[PDB]
Design a protein around this ligand. Structure first.
Ligand SMILES: [Mn+2]
Ligand SMILES: [Mn+2]
Ligand SMILES: [Mn+2]
Ligand SMILES: [Mn+2]
Lengths: 350, 337, 311, 305, 350, 336
């Protein structure tokens, strides 16, 4: 049976550390991976193949699965490099969050499930792979963090969550500068500008539990807006978030997308974030979330909870700094730290 | 057709909005007859000239990067229910190969007068701040001695050098020359954003001596930004026949506009500038729009150029909304074909 | 013509007599030392890049009616051997003591945060056991490792060493901006055990920033004979401080730090200023270095205005 | 005046009648298509960057006493939808056929190496089944995948598809520069099964480079009615071609490729020229793009001489 | 007991490949790691902790061990980032070299032993760790590829090989723009400019089996030259290599450093390579090996063979391209392909 | 003191060779009496002037970058047994703040005259190629009408524009003005490296009309490089009283010098240039050394600037060796 095991501060051999909590404390025998990444996984978590049986044997309650596919893209390639920058950037952090008093790694028994393989030029088959890999994670008993990759990710992601949800109801929250509601793009129903209409098409995802937040600017053809008008789906534009406040808007939308639902899919485009904080993106955009608001939105999402969180369109080759990759680390870590603090306050288990 | 409003259809219709002219607009020659006949409201004019710059080089390549960045957007603005398609044309660049700075300015002057003659609004993309001297002179001449001009500029530098190395029309002289225009009353002049350590004392002294009522960055913060902006909009637009609006995006906090000729952190946020754009558009018109001092070689991921494009196109969309120039919001993509 | 110095200032040797005679109030001291760094490399280049960035600014601050011309001199870089940290730190110590002896304010530019350990010890020794020191540091990391990889004077140990100085009462210590996960549990435990009343970023946001900053300014300046002020610009939001050794999202924005500088300058003096962990290889068009320069120069101008030292 | 074109050349619509009337011998065709790419992203930006780099050069080549002014026109970029590779390739096919119809030489700039599959097929269809094609490619990778991830028209399949064209005899095919381990065993096996006489980089160095290049030039041009010439600039040593999709150490130096250009130009003609896998995000001060531009422009000047 | 096992083209889960030779062929079900690195080790080889018993149980005959330590450096930090760049760049190649017809991974049973931990600020202790980690590899029965990291690496590296060689004789070859023969640097005997004197100091490393190749230019204080004069150690400067020919010089020098020896330590500074092919270095230098000559020297080294190859001073942050990291892949890969071809020709086993 | 020859000792002697003046030389004011008194052979003069450039901007920052890169090396050259310590001084930069180009050139001229008056060899670092017009005119005037000058320049561009945009002293005019100097016979002029698509026909035509026997890059390749370089060296040095030597490192292949104002692959390799340096040094003297058109904003890892410093310092070291000005090889670090 699979064992959930990792080395604190990564290195084995003669100077290996063994303390059961050593990973939340300053390193003792050496520098760990804070300067040189070595063979780091996401968070230094154990690797676990995307297999329901291995995941359940490990007891893992969060699977990190990268979906680097970036050839379902209408804008420009580059998000295939996102997951490597993200994993590298987790070496700059401990898995312990003092702001929540949570050891994320042991609280959730996080595992890194590696990457979904791709079939270049073949968006249909690559998305079939993604849905099958996500299904292994859900059937293994874990909630999922999916790291893109382009915004076609919510199509297989929400389909797998929908199948898993069965006769229940699933909500869908889409946070993005771009409305992403093309009925098709040059005839194709499954590009990265169709996450929302493809989620609505699922048998147990209803307009009343869908919402969109963060939109602004003109990369937004009229049919993407008309989709929300005709289906009466709530859209919170970035100017509305600024006027009313992220807390009011985010809490209102989470209540809406979770009302009478058994599951929630939450897709988050890095372009929601102001380009000043997030230059490494396929289609970066001014007039977005400021950095403190990103962390607040991750905290709010953590309080409410989702079953799958996906984060997409990170393009590290476009940023000579570490700001973009470390922003995406904090989206995940504050979501998980808030989620753990909430579960613990409620006396519930992950 | 309305196909440009929507995601492309399949078959022969499928294309790529990203694959160069301003906003994918038609090219129209710098000729008043053609411009009057093309139906557009704006004419984009690139001015790849930097011989007036005494600072970091790079502004010569701005026009090309600005055009490239606009390919990243549709002409439709869902926030305004406005379509900019057909509203602008791209006149190319002013030709300045191997000529004296004086010839360059002559060619700039001729280009701007020609657009103004057609009735279109020039959108002039530099290039260095010196080009504003020539473009403002063209507006001044175009309206004539019987009309009054207003002038509004956003930037961290006052550019109030009376002379620089013995020269009178370099970039740091620009406001000193513009405020000498004979039909531009100083009371109809606004300058917003001046910063400490970017402004030598004689530029302040000359501003005070001439009565230039500039709004420094501190003045704006002290006022909550918008009420002071509104007072300066009122001075520029109340009682004037034509308004010149110019931007040096070093008015923005450096994080939002790194690819500019000179910058110091502590300027405007993009969300503040987007509000300001709507306030300007409430006055229902502008006679010239310029942007200078973008510096692509210092830009990262195109950040300053993208900000500039979003500000300029938002201004055009907001002006259309103020005029009631909106599309039929009942249109749907299923109408096509 | 051809020498690159802080704010285009005169070069003056690191000699108390020369420094006292030159007429400036500040002495810039470059410390290209990075062998206390446990993270990504690059801060050794910061003193040069910082100097270069300051060349672009005029010395006149029209909002304060202050001209910084003549107010600083540049002492060059501390001469230190590589792969010999104990000797390097002794060289830093002697340089800071010599500037303090002159009566000028050292402006110390690293280099990694470990240099603060030595510079703070030099201030502590300079004022002596009958005087009281205050200490204020801005940064996203607490740096409260009692030891790190078994070592005791690395960058993540800095506050653990500085708060051991015998004339630095913990009630006169401020640390502002801590946030995110480069703050392992023992740094918080040691802070609680010692009574380090740090102002985390979340606490600052909850308070509206300035009222809490003012309270911590009062603790550092009220009742103390000398004050040490230090910056790791990862206290700033990543957007405005990308080029730092460990950038951090969700921090102060440029206009907020500028307001804080004016609040500090109201106190009418500071004894040492440091800035460490600028990291030019990671910067975006010099933004972090420019932010640092504007913060330092604005503090000098605001102090000059407080003192009535105007044009 | 503000429109960026290859060599500051006139823009001409991609229309055989217009191209035949404009007086140029070459038509630059940008193909910013990268959906056949299996490696690092970035080649979609190469047509624009290539055009920009050519702006820096004068059109007069004094060693040849040739001025390239008027020799080329720029047809812009082929219009192609994203996430629709079959339609995108159809668009490329039609564009290359239309240029060939005009009698001008297309200079096709990708984009990924998959584009060559279609452009070569267009040439094959243009000359028809009673004529013979020759094909010469420079690159570090054989691209002899019969399939890759189960797909048949990705970049690493390009030579496997091109050597299936019916009027391209394998004895009229040359491939120069193969080296280093981005050449899996099946690419070698398939080359051996088909009789592909590739000139590996080690083969070239052993021969002093040029004598072997000359033999392969003779195989491609002798007896053929049309010749296709393609470049992946990773054939060049990494030092002079850093900005390519998959850079490779230990290759040709700039002065060596320049000599080879002259040797090719001695044959007095070429039917299609392609350059793929330029990758500006990896370039060092534009060096690979400048190398590519100098090779193409020296080829035009040497042919004119 | 440890097992030597890896997944061809890396990805597990529903689309995993299983063919025992699949790693030498175009990938079949997906793209492997050619676009997105995933959780790649060096060459995609099995990870094996640096532990003599585990290494021997897997039968590994080459250990890749990174030594990212870059704080024994008298120039500038940055080489701590080399090994991550190197590992990432191996995803751009197959483990099969058609130029030698060799499957490097299966031929040598390559393993990736991770990184040697460091103690920042403490060059003495960090080198003690490095020597102990190398000793585990040697005692496990493998030859070693050591990847820096700064040029203090040959001090613990040659010390560990010398320990392992015992009463036998060890040669030492140092290839570098810089002579690296300081008796001490500011009093310190073990910085990255003292590889050669520390090796001569070893009891079983003799001057007649030492040599230096590749030197030029003036980052070369007189005491570094005096060392070679005073100990009669042969120096082949880069101009001699160019004048006489790389092959003639390198074969003479390998014959010298191997003559009547039981082992050979070969340390190779990336600065030996001309700066036009290697900008990513702590102290880059013009007037060096051109790219084809680097490969040729790697092939020559492989024909003769060494027991430890180390490659140092790679600083990938300084290079916006992949040229420098891919050059270091080829240094290793051509060394191993040539070594395997030679062993096979001699009917010998790794 | 000989400590600078060797690795630093410990104790108070520990320091960091890379932690600014040219080759860590003493600063001496631009004053002939002071320069004559300091004992040096060369005076480094920075000229951060780019108003003559019509191409990519950036050379204004080259003197500062060049100075910084020389900190990466010791003064001792093991290949030559020579020490450059004390052989140069650094005069700082010519002061040209907020002045007209005519005034800037006047200041450059006076600076060059002043150094030449001292007897030291100016090493002039630009800055754009136009500086060479003024510096060569200063040499021409310094030696006077009864002496003869020789001139040799390496670069990809001939710079033989008679005029540019109505101007006659911009960078692309530089050789057209230099070859008008009255004591520089065209038979004593060498220009090596001209490239295709960097040289307008009018530049070739004016060269031919004047008898400028430039050695194009193809000419050099056809000759095996060194024999033709040797013939042009002989023309510049034989029979002349002073020699001006200038470098535009776009003569080098682009990968070997990316940080330059204008470049095209297919130029000299560094190993070729290092051989040429020795061939020049064999002639035993030079009167002025210039380098122009370095462009640090386009450099990567300081490649072009490092190449430039290594060429210039190697030339100084090779000249010292040709002069027999070598150190005592018996010196050891244990003497200190
Ligand atoms: Mn999206
Ligand atoms: Mn989006
Ligand atoms: Mn070395
Ligand atoms: Mn070295």
């Amino acid at each position: 049976t699979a064992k959930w095991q990792f080395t604190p501060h990564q290195h084995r051999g003669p100077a290996e550390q063994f303390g059961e909590n050593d990973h939340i404390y300053s390193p003792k025998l050496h520098n760990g991976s804070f300067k040189s990444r070595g063979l780091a996984t996401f968070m230094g978590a154990p690797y676990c193949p995307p297999d329901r049986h291995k995941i359940r044997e490990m007891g893992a309650k969060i699977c990190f699965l990268a979906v680097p596919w970036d050839q379902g893209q209408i804008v420009r390639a580059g998000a295939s490099q996102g997951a490597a920058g993200l994993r590298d950037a987790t070496t700059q952090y401990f898995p312990y969050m003092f702001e929540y008093d949570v050891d994320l790694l042991s609280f959730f028994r996080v595992v890194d499930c590696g990457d979904v393989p791709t079939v270049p030029g073949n968006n249909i088959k690559s998305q079939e792979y993604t849905a099958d890999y996500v299904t292994e994670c859900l059937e293994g008993g874990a909630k999922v963090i999916l790291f893109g990759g382009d915004h076609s990710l919510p199509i297989p992601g929400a389909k797998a969550l929908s199948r898993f949800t069965g006769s229940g109801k699933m909500g869908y929250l889409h946070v993005d500068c771009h409305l992403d509601a093309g009925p098709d793009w040059a005839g194709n129903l499954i590009t990265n500008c169709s996450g929302a209409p493809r989620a609505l098409d699922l048998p147990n995802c209803n307009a009343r539990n869908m919402a969109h937040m963060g939109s602004r600017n003109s990369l937004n053809p009229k049919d993407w807006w008309d989709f929300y008008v005709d289906n009466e789906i709530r859209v919170v534009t970035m100017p509305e978030m600024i006027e009313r406040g992220l807390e009011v808007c985010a809490n209102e939308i989470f209540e809406r997308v979770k009302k009478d639902t058994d599951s929630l899919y939450f897709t988050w485009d890095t372009d929601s974030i102001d380009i000043s904080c997030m230059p490494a993106n396929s289609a970066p955009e001014c007039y977005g979330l400021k950095g403190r608001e990103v962390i607040q939105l991750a905290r709010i999402a953590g309080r409410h909870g989702c079953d799958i969180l996906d984060i997409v369109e990170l393009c590290p080759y476009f940023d000579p700094s570490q700001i973009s990759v470390k922003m995406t680390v904090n989206m995940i870590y504050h979501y998980l730290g808030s989620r753990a603090q909430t579960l613990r306050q409620q006396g519930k288990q992950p | 057709s309305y196909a440009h409003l929507f995601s492309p259809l399949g078959g022969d219709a499928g294309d790529n909005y990203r694959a160069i002219t301003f906003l994918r607009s038609a090219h129209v020659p710098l000729n008043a007859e053609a411009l009057k006949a093309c139906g557009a409201k704006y004419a984009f004019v690139g001015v790849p000239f930097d011989e007036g710059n005494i600072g970091k080089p790079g502004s010569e390549d701005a026009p090309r990067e600005f055009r490239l960045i606009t390919q990243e957007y549709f002409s439709y603005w869902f926030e305004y229910n406005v379509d900019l398609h057909g509203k602008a044309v791209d006149c190319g660049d002013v030709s300045m190969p191997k000529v004296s700075p004086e010839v360059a300015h002559e060619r700039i002057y001729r280009a701007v007068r020609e657009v103004l003659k057609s009735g279109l609004i020039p959108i002039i993309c530099g290039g260095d701040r010196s080009i504003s001297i020539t473009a403002a002179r063209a507006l001044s001449d175009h309206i004539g001695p019987q009309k009054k001009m207003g002038y509004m500029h956003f930037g961290a530098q006052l550019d109030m050098a009376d002379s620089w190395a013995g020269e009178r029309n370099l970039a740091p002289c620009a406001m000193a020359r513009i405020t000498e225009l004979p039909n531009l009353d100083i009371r109809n002049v606004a300058h917003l954003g001046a910063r400490n350590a970017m402004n030598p004392k004689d530029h302040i002294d000359l501003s005070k001596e001439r009565g230039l009522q500039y709004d420094s960055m501190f003045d704006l913060f002290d006022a909550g930004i918008y009420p002071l902006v509104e007072r300066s909009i009122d001075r520029v637009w109340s009682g004037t026949d034509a308004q010149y609006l110019g931007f040096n995006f070093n008015v923005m906090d450096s994080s939002t506009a790194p690819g500019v000729t000179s910058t110091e952190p502590g300027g405007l946020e993009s969300r503040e500038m987007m509000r300001i754009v709507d306030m300007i558009a409430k006055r229902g018109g502008v006679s010239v729009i310029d942007l200078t001092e973008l510096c692509p070689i210092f830009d990262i991921s195109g950040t300053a150029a993208r900000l500039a494009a979003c500000v300029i196109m938002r201004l055009m969309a907001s002006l259309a909304a103020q005029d009631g120039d909106v599309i039929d919001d009942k249109l749907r993509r299923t109408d096509l074909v």
